[PDB]
From a paper:
Notwithstanding this diversity colicins invariably have a similar domain arrangement, where a central receptor-binding (R) domain is flanked by an N-terminal translocation (T) domain and a C-terminal cytotoxic (C) domain. E-type colicins parasitize the vitamin B12 receptor, BtuB, as their primary receptor in the outer membrane and the Tol-Pal complex in the periplasm. The catalytic centre of most colicin and pyocin DNases is the HNH/ββα-Me motif, a 34-amino acid motif containing invariant histidine residues, which chelates a single divalent metal ion that catalyzes phosphodiester bond hydrolysis. DNase-specific Im proteins are small acidic inhibitors that bind to an exosite and inhibit colicin or pyocin activity indirectly by blocking substrate-binding.
We therefore switched to using a disulphided form of ColE9 in which Tyr324 and Leu447 in the R-domain were mutated to cysteine, which has been reported previously. We obtained X-ray diffracting crystals of this disulphide locked form of the ColE9–Im9 complex in the P21 space group, and the structure was refined to a resolution of 3.2 Å. The asymmetric unit contains four ColE9–Im9 complexes, two pairs of molecules related by non-crystallographic two-fold symmetry. The final model of the ColE9–Im9 complex contains 488 residues of ColE9 (85–580) and 83 residues of Im9 (3–85). No electron density was visible for the first 84 N-terminal residues of ColE9 that comprise the intrinsically unstructured translocation domain (IUTD) of the colicin, consistent with nuclear magnetic resonance spectroscopy data showing that this domain is disordered. In the present structure, however, no additional electron density was observed in the HNH motif, suggesting that no metal ion is bound within the catalytic centre.
Author numbering:
A (entry chain A): 85 to 125, 132 to 580
B (entry chain E): 3 to 85
């Protein structure tokens, strides 16, 4: 039962008796500690990438799961020992979770938010030093401690070990096929509590599905966080530019290199072409002795024959090589034109982006409220789902004007707070809804006006912020229901 | 940590609906996460409206909503609470 190193994802084919895992006592390597330390100061770092094509070569049935394990104390702030026996869920600082990024399913170490997991006790069994944790939704996970044999990292053609350990933002759908738990042993065993996540291996069809769902959630988040959706592009548009610039540089190297090779091969040829002319004159010289087979010359002639076929073959070889160099040089010259055209487009992209990144940055910098708004009725919030939405109400404008707000986010919170206190605007809000408006938050819409995760009334602008339109101008602003706004822009 | 309404006891479920109605959250994003979660447990057609846009004469206080979900689910062939 050679033990698998902590923090190194491996396949365990299940049995009828559940999964088989064998841990060690020996503490987790510099690597993972590194990651968890790095990661300490939702984002995450990829341990592995999965390739179903391969996993099936050995596990054709696709029954195999992917287990990964850590010693609980490295995850949890409160030692598992000093924890009530009534608690089913201990809080954790990081988790091991399946994510889907760049078109492969992959196992990875997540963090950056509040997280907390099942805690389950491990019943013992006939076998000596072998217990059964059963985590809801996984198979029976029968464990086995071993500090006798030196630790191993298992290597399976399906599961890869992605070197790039950059912290990247993590999946919205993270964990969608994972079940983890801190598992504790009974007190008279002396075995440390161990963390285990157990993830399904998604098939490529299922991965495209997660991928799709992942992209859709990203859209939502992008429309409900303009503040910094833009600030993200500016990174992608700057990265794409910095990369494209290097492309020019590497092309220049190839093309400046092709110019010398051209020049060199060109002169190699010239020389070799003079040598032919020399030898071919030398044969003209002794041409005389051509039909006198018993003369000094009819050797000296034959000799020139040879000098020439040699000198001639040489020319043929220098020519191929020169042609070839000429080809390379032409292709190279086009590679820059093409590659350097790419930089011009990428340099335009990064301008557009950086302009938008500063206009969409204004809505996160202070200002004074302005405008008059317009009269409204009892059906104020009803209007937010008709026409071009409902406007800010006059009565609200009046109460807010000239006041200073640290950020437009605060201006919304405040608009709703003047709606909660106004009986006629707030006539449409319920007790449960009113709890949200006065707590700041945007009030919820009817179901029929909701769209996925956008379930609450939105403040938008007519003349957008990205087209320099005033952030805080209440004649500008429009209350809309998620659906209504979505419809408005099509 | 809870995929079916049958993971919740009646008194456990009530707590979630009393969290949501009072808006007892650290952020609007965690509130909306709770409501989106509530919706899925109920499988109910009104959806979020059970809380924020109740029918005429329904009870919209935390309990009455637990009560609406309870009898609806039972009356349309659906699993019940824990216990």
């Amino acid at each position: 039962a050679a033990p698998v190193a902590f923090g190194f994802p491996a396949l365990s084919t299940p049995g009828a008796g559940g999964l088989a895992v064998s841990i060690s006592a020996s503490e987790l390597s510099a690597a993972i500690a590194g990651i968890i330390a790095k990661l300490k100061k939702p984002f995450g770092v990829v341990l592995s990438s999965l390739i179903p094509s391969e996993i099936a070569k050995d596990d054709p049935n696709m029954m195999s799961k992917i287990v990964t394990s850590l010693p609980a104390d490295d995850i949890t702030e409160s030692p598992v020992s000093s924890l009530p026996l009534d608690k089913a869920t201990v809080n954790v600082n990081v988790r091991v979770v399946d994510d889907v990024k760049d078109e492969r399913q992959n196992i990875s170490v997540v963090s950056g938010v509040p997280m907390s997991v099942p805690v389950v006790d491990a019943k013992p069994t006939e076998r000596p030093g072998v217990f059964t944790a059963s985590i809801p939704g996984a198979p029976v996970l029968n464990i086995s401690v071993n500090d006798s044999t030196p630790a191993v990292q298992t290597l399976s053609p399906g599961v890869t070990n992605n070197t790039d350990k950059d912290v990247r933002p993590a999946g919205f759908t993270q964990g969608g096929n994972t079940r983890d738990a801190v598992i504790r042993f009974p007190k008279d065993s002396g075995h440390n509590a161990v963390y285990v996540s157990v993830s399904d291996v998604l098939s490529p069809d299922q991965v495209k599905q997660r991928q799709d769902e992942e992209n859709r959630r990203q859209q939502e988040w992008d429309a409900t966080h303009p503040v910094e959706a833009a600030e993200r592009n500016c990174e992608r548009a700057r990265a794409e530019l910095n990369q494209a610039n290097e492309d020019v540089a590497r092309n220049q190297e190839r093309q400046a290199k092709a110019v010398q090779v051209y020049n060199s091969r060109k002169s190699e040829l010239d020389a070799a072409n003079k040598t032919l002319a020399d030898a071919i004159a030398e044969i003209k010289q002794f041409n005389r002795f051509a039909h006198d087979p018993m003369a000094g010359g009819h050797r000296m002639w034959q000799m020139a024959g040879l000098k020439a076929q040699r000198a001639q073959t040489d020319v043929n070889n220098k020519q191929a090589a020169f042609d070839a160099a000429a080809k390379e040089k032409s292709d190279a010259d086009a590679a820059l034109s093409a590659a350097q055209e790419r930089r011009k487009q990428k340099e335009n992209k990064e301008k557009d982006a950086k302009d938008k990144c500063a206009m969409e940055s204004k809505r996160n910098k202070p200002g004074k409220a302005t405008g008059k708004g317009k009269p409204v009725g009892d059906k104020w919030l009803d209007d937010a789902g008709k026409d071009s939405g409902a406007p800010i109400p006059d009565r609200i404008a009046d109460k807010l004007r000239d006041k200073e707000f640290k950020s437009f986010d605060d201006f919304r919170k405040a608009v709703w707070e003047e709606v909660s206190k106004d009986p006629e605007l707030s006539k449409n809000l319920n007790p449960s809804n009113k709890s949200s408006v006065s707590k700041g938050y945007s009030p919820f819409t009817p179901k029929n006006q909701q769209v996925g995760g956008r379930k609450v009334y939105e403040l938008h602008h007519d003349k957008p912020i990205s087209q320099g339109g005033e952030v805080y101008d209440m004649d500008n602003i429009r209350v809309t229901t998620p659906k209504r706004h979505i419809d408005i822009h099509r | 940590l809870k995929h079916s309404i049958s993971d919740y006891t009646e008194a456990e479920f009530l707590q979630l609906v009393t969290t949501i109605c009072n808006a007892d959250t650290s952020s609007e994003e965690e509130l909306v996460k709770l409501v989106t979660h509530f919706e899925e447990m109920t499988e109910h057609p009104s959806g979020s409206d059970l809380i924020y846009y109740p029918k005429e004469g329904d009870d919209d206080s935390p309990s009455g909503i637990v009560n609406t979900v309870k009898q609806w689910r039972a009356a349309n062939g659906k699993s019940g609470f824990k216990q």
